[PDB]
Design a protein around this ligand. Sequence first.
Ligand code: BB2
Ligand code: BB2
Ligand code: ZN
Length: 185
Amino acid sequence: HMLTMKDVIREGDPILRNVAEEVSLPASEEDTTTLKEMIEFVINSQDPEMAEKYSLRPGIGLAAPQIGVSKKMIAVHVTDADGTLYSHALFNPKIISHSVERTYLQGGEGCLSVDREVPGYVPRYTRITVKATSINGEEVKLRLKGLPAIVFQHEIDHLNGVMFYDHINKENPFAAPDDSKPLER
Ligand SMILES: CCCCC[C@H](CC(=O)NO)C(=O)N[C@H](C(=O)N1CCC[C@H]1CO)C(C)C
Ligand SMILES: CCCCC[C@H](CC(=O)NO)C(=O)N[C@H](C(=O)N1CCC[C@H]1CO)C(C)C
Ligand SMILES: [Zn+2]
């Protein structure tokens, strides 16, 4: 069994606004399988062949709530400008520290759960330290910046019932956030 867009729920579903439940670790086969299918989905969505074979909208991350599972699980598969790949399948991911300084994609953010465009900068912390447990069972401590840090914040926001547009400015989507700068290479 594998995930497709049919499994992705859209905004309006209360689950997207609830706080995902902590995953009991060591993880069960069920939760492991859920997470395995999540990272498979994200990676397949970036392969033209597979994306068409299952009509998948390309994306660089996914949170369990998005597929109807209210548990703390995320999948991230993003490559930065330097060609550095950040591929993670995680249980109970949490930001233990974030920079005061912020950043943002000038073209905004999109979400697989949102069938519409919401223009405006989505302020994000430039640097974050994340602690979680990999699908492989090992605890991990990741220090991210730039695009990878942005994707992690977006996915973890999903686990706390937060949507990307909740961060967009009030009646001035393009105002420069205090102490910040557009995403750098
Ligand atoms: C940048 C924050 C992380 C985005 C994660 C989403 C996937 C998602 O909804 N996760 O919960 C995605 O890939 N969204 C894409 C997106 O918003 N992107 C992809 C490149 C950067 C940004 C556009 O500015 C669109 C194209 C589906
Ligand atoms: C509407 C978008 C306008 C963004 C313009 C900046 C221009 C710049 O000053 N770069 O250093 C850019 O290309 N930035 C990149 C960017 O946003 N890109 C590069 C490829 C496309 C787009 C990401 O969606 C970085 C931040 C990743
Ligand atoms: Zn999303």
